[PDB]
Amino acid sequence: YSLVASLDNVRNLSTILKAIHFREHATCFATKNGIKVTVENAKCVQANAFIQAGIFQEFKVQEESVTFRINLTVLLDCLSIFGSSPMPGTLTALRMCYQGYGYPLMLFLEEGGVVTVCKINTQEPEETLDFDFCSTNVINKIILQSEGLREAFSELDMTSEVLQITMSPDKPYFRLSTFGNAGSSHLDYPKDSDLMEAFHCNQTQVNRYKISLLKPSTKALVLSCKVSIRTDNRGFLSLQYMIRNEDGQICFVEYYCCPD
């Protein structure tokens, strides 16, 4: 039975998974501290999540860690099978069991007397990169809100091919540039605003990024309340989000991308 997990609010896990859903497959990691689902694409972009043991009520694991690969679309569809619009006062409960290697994943859901049973067979594993972004070589870091860039990143889907990010202590403190068919489009963000919680950039940094790799950050930006931007000496970009649930807990999602 290796790992069994039970919960009464599927929405937390469902929204955490939906915040990272742009590929088709995902890899899990069950450890005494909790699960960790990661995904990679183009051997450059990598997105990971974290669901600590504090959220869970009935969590049981056996011996060492457990790894398996699961289709994300099917799991996300199965989780939200009772409608993604519940009125206040209605909840859904789920139970999941994984009985070791070579056997599928169970999922029993219940709500108001209706009981559903589903199974997802897993064919694992893959290999993941080693994107180590420890806070030792980080040179430029910023922390900022989300409602500022809701429309900004919404006003970012054009027929361009490269997004230019420049950050400097003076003049264009945080400028995004997009070169398309019509013309340039600058979106300068200054300091000392309502969305400037800490500015600590050291030296000027201008870099180019691919639109195709960096596009799926909209889903993480929409379901968030704060965003942290980090870039090191070489020019690798690290994005840290902060999502909350109905109960009042906090979960994190991280994105790693490499420059052109």
Partner: protein
Amino acid sequence: MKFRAKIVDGACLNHFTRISNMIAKLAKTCTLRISPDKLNFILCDGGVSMWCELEQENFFNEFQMEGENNEIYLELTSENLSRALKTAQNARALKIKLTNKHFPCLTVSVELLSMSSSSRIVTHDIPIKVIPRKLWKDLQEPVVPDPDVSIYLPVLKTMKSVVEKMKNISNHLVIEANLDGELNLKIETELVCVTTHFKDLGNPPLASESTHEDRNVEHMAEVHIDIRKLLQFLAGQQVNPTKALCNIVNNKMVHFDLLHEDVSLQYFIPALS
């Protein structure tokens, strides 16, 4: 052939608007059967057959007609009728009358009132095609055979949501009805298998009480259908009635009975996906 009808009451007009919207969402072209007593919405063909029965005396205050065999059959597009009725939500008077201005038409005239003393008049001419009597037998109400199992239906919203989420995985569904009020929806793919259960559904008292001593209560007469016509039928409905019944037979037929306010709905979905 003559037909004239008058609608004044607001609630009746709103109910007529709801019925027209429902039939427009359910089907494209429909048949209207007008009788001295009642109205019938017919569709016959994917072999889904659609019957809707409506009492005339509870909606119109003035209603006159003339067709020996006093019975009017009309074939028309439902979208035109729905668009015509949409503009009379806040109206005052509505008149429906058969006319032959240029081609056979079902004139709908609506009197709009406003702050102005003058009353606006909006007129629409929906074309009609009178079906000859030779086909009158082919539009009759479908017969209901003896059901293998008759079961009360659950809440429509939850079933609709579950079916809608089930549409993505596959295009095949299996419905199972038990004798203890258990309804099972099953899909089985080469990668994922899903089954949803319903219990505590009151079994209505069956007419035949002498054919239950050798029939297992745990036995079932499940059937399999293509999930492309069930979803329309659940999506069209907007209010949950109090006469939700399902009759299931073993071989090739599933049948739905609904009744809300004073309108009855009979649903027939062929099996063998």
